[PDB]
Design an enzyme around this catalytic site. Structure first.
Site, PDB file in Angstrom:
ATOM      1  N   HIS A  95      31.569  24.172 -28.822  1.00  0.00           N
ATOM      2  CA  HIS A  95      31.973  22.782 -28.952  1.00  0.00           C
ATOM      3  C   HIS A  95      32.664  22.597 -30.292  1.00  0.00           C
ATOM      4  O   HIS A  95      32.576  23.451 -31.178  1.00  0.00           O
ATOM      5  CB  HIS A  95      30.779  21.829 -28.782  1.00  0.00           C
ATOM      6  CG  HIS A  95      29.622  22.142 -29.674  1.00  0.00           C
ATOM      7  ND1 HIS A  95      28.805  23.237 -29.483  1.00  0.00           N
ATOM      8  CD2 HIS A  95      29.143  21.501 -30.765  1.00  0.00           C
ATOM      9  CE1 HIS A  95      27.871  23.253 -30.417  1.00  0.00           C
ATOM     10  NE2 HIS A  95      28.054  22.212 -31.208  1.00  0.00           N
ATOM     11  N   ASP A 102      26.017  26.854 -31.848  1.00  0.00           N
ATOM     12  CA  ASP A 102      25.034  26.358 -32.799  1.00  0.00           C
ATOM     13  C   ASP A 102      24.083  27.463 -33.241  1.00  0.00           C
ATOM     14  O   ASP A 102      23.710  28.350 -32.466  1.00  0.00           O
ATOM     15  CB  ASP A 102      24.213  25.220 -32.195  1.00  0.00           C
ATOM     16  CG  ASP A 102      24.934  23.902 -32.232  1.00  0.00           C
ATOM     17  OD1 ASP A 102      26.092  23.879 -32.698  1.00  0.00           O
ATOM     18  OD2 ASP A 102      24.351  22.887 -31.796  1.00  0.00           O
ATOM     19  N   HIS A 146      32.527  26.314 -32.390  1.00  0.00           N
ATOM     20  CA  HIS A 146      31.384  27.096 -32.829  1.00  0.00           C
ATOM     21  C   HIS A 146      30.306  27.040 -31.759  1.00  0.00           C
ATOM     22  O   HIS A 146      30.314  26.177 -30.876  1.00  0.00           O
ATOM     23  CB  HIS A 146      30.824  26.562 -34.149  1.00  0.00           C
ATOM     24  CG  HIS A 146      30.282  25.175 -34.041  1.00  0.00           C
ATOM     25  ND1 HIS A 146      31.092  24.066 -33.924  1.00  0.00           N
ATOM     26  CD2 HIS A 146      29.008  24.719 -33.982  1.00  0.00           C
ATOM     27  CE1 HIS A 146      30.340  22.985 -33.806  1.00  0.00           C
ATOM     28  NE2 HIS A 146      29.072  23.354 -33.839  1.00  0.00           N
TER      29      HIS A 146
HETATM   30  C1  LIG Z   1      28.393  18.884 -34.436  1.00  0.00           C
HETATM   31  C2  LIG Z   1      27.378  18.149 -35.303  1.00  0.00           C
HETATM   32  C3  LIG Z   1      25.970  18.671 -35.048  1.00  0.00           C
HETATM   33  C4  LIG Z   1      27.751  18.231 -36.796  1.00  0.00           C
HETATM   34  N1  LIG Z   1      27.992  19.601 -37.213  1.00  0.00           N
HETATM   35  C5  LIG Z   1      27.024  20.342 -37.762  1.00  0.00           C
HETATM   36  O1  LIG Z   1      25.933  19.884 -38.084  1.00  0.00           O
HETATM   37  C6  LIG Z   1      27.321  21.827 -37.948  1.00  0.00           C
HETATM   38  C7  LIG Z   1      27.708  22.394 -36.593  1.00  0.00           C
HETATM   39  S1  LIG Z   1      26.342  22.391 -35.406  1.00  0.00           S
HETATM   40  N2  LIG Z   1      26.138  22.503 -38.447  1.00  0.00           N
HETATM   41  C8  LIG Z   1      26.073  23.080 -39.647  1.00  0.00           C
HETATM   42  O2  LIG Z   1      26.978  23.000 -40.475  1.00  0.00           O
HETATM   43  C9  LIG Z   1      24.797  23.829 -39.932  1.00  0.00           C
HETATM   44  C10 LIG Z   1      23.897  23.086 -40.912  1.00  0.00           C
HETATM   45  C11 LIG Z   1      22.613  23.845 -41.218  1.00  0.00           C
HETATM   46  C12 LIG Z   1      21.793  23.195 -42.349  1.00  0.00           C
HETATM   47  N3  LIG Z   1      22.554  23.090 -43.606  1.00  0.00           N
HETATM   48  C13 LIG Z   1      20.504  23.975 -42.585  1.00  0.00           C
HETATM   49  O3  LIG Z   1      20.278  24.525 -43.641  1.00  0.00           O
HETATM   50  O4  LIG Z   1      19.696  23.982 -41.558  1.00  0.00           O
HETATM   51  C14 LIG Z   1      28.952  17.353 -37.102  1.00  0.00           C
HETATM   52  O5  LIG Z   1      28.988  16.186 -36.754  1.00  0.00           O
HETATM   53  O6  LIG Z   1      29.913  17.962 -37.744  1.00  0.00           O
HETATM   54 FE   LIG Z   2      27.235  22.314 -33.253  1.00  0.00          FE
END
Ligand SMILES: CC(C)[C@@H](NC(=O)[C@H](CS)NC(=O)CCC[C@H](N)C(=O)O)C(=O)O
Ligand SMILES: [Fe+2]
Length: 329
Positions: A268, A214, A212
């Site tokens: 990533h 970010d 994905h």
């Molecule tokens: C890669 C990390 C940042 C983490 N993944 C994540 O946090 C993943 C990918 S960046 N991010 C999400 O699902 C978005 C969350 C947004 C949040 N609910 C909001 O309302 O703002 C992991 O460890 O899975």
């Molecule tokens: Fe991410």
């Protein structure tokens, strides 16, 4: 054979000071990292990450099923129609290993004008009972402002790196309206580990979360010392080494939009590792109405033909797209 990504450690302490040449030297390093793999570690950041990890662990390990239902987002509890973002994201024993707790700007109260207007993406945080989790809310709200401060400083570095005055981004990143979020993610050790929670990549790698970009301007991430992240390059995925003293920084797709992809949002993914660990991102989001005119640093005149994009519309669409593509977390 999987290679290791070049992820420099950048002392960001000058971004809190008034030595302008030192700040330029930091900006140069941010520029170089942003044009290479897209990741760097911020060191000398001033945040007490030992306390962050300890308080988060105490919360994850002491919360009960009853409390999780009471804090659950709408995806897990149909009574909570107003909790799309903020609240608890439950694990599913035997199916889904990850669980997390997401909170937003502590200034979003029932009296806040965006909450009064029912503006999408704004919600009031939900919290566990103080008597069952003493000091947790105080800690978590304080942490929000600590990482907000670090992120503001980083945004000055990004502005200078692109040839802009240091408040170019930071002026849109305000305590009264930021849509930034903290997510406290627990990745558990499980034996046996549920096969439904492991995805197989096209290249055969076992993953916890697929590729994905970010949904953020930048992402400011603290993780415990277990290697898990990989970044895509033209020659394949490369491992990002862990460092539990630093913050891992990368750009999100809003930065790529406003720079005409000069600073790309690195793709990533998260490898599956059977280890108890923490992943604690802070997503630097602007305000709902924030708009930055796109520009192209490659052109002398900086001219770009990309449309300005309101941050609120960007965020609403981006969060839904990420769920649709990579699953409800
Ligand atoms: C890669 C990390 C940042 C983490 N993944 C994540 O946090 C993943 C990918 S960046 N991010 C999400 O699902 C978005 C969350 C947004 C949040 N609910 C909001 O309302 O703002 C992991 O460890 O899975
Ligand atoms: Fe991410």
């Amino acid at each position: 054979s999987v290679s290791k990504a070049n992820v420099p450690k950048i002392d960001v302490s000058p971004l809190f000071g008034d030595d302008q040449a030192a700040k330029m030297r930091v900006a140069q390093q941010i520029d170089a990292a942003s044009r290479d793999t897209g990741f760097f570690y911020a060191v000398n950041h001033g945040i007490n990450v030992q306390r962050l990890s300890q308080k988060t662990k105490e919360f994850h390990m002491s919360i009960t099923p009853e409390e999780k239902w009471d804090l659950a987002i709408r995806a897990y509890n149909k009574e909570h129609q107003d909790q799309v973002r903020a609240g608890y994201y439950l694990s599913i024993p035997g199916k889904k290993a990850v669980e997390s707790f997401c909170y937003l700007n502590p200034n979003f109260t029932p009296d806040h004008p965006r909450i009064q207007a029912k503006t999408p993406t704004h919600e009031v945080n939900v919290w566990p009972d103080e008597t069952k989790h003493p000091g947790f809310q105080d800690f978590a709200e304080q942490y929000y402002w600590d990482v907000f401060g670090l992120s503001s400083a980083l945004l000055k570095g990004y502005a200078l790196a692109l040839g802009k005055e240091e408040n170019f981004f930071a002026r849109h990143f305000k305590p009264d309206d930021t849509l930034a979020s903290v997510v406290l993610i627990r990745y558990p050790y499980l034996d046996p580990y549920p096969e439904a929670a492991i995805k197989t990549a096209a290249d055969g790698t076992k993953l916890s979360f697929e590729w994905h970009e970010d949904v953020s301007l930048i992402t400011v991430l603290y993780q415990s010392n277990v290697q898990n992240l990989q970044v895509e390059t033209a020659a394949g995925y490369q491992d990002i080494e862990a460092d539990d003293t630093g913050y891992l920084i990368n750009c999100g797709s809003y930065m790529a939009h406003l720079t005409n992809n000069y600073y790309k949002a690195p793709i990533h993914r998260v490898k599956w590792v059977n280890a108890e660990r923490q992943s604690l991102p802070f997503f630097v989001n602007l305000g709902y109405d924030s708009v930055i005119d796109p520009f192209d640093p490659r052109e002398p005149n900086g001219k770009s033909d990309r449309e300005p994009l309101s941050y609120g519309d960007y965020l609403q669409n981006g969060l839904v797209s990420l769920i649709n593509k990579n699953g409800q977390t």
